[PDB]
Write a protein that binds this DNA or RNA. Structure first.
Length: 77
DNA sequence: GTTGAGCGT
């Protein structure tokens, strides 16, 4: 398993929210929501790591409606 | 108090 980058997150979406959402597919190791260090405002993308590689491809294969926006899980660059 | 292609100290 590898980290997946999550593009398109609503600005209000928190690491708590991601954990909840992604947990529905499989077991989650960690989630991150990248934020500006001065203001804490989310930058609109984050990361996720699953324990099971099965869950990763399942998640990588489809778009995701998270808090009102379609999001994409890709392999980072 | 804003936005929507954005890739991580």
């Amino acid at each position: 398993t590898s980290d997946l980058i999550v593009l398109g997150l609503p600005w209000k979406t928190t690491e708590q929210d991601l954990k909840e959402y992604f947990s529905t597919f499989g077991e989650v190791l960690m989630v991150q929501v990248k934020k500006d260090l001065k203001t804490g405002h989310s930058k609109g993308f984050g990361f996720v790591r699953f324990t099971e590689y099965e869950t990763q491809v399942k998640v990588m294969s489809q778009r995701h409606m998270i808090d009102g926006r379609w999001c994409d899980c890709k392999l980072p660059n």
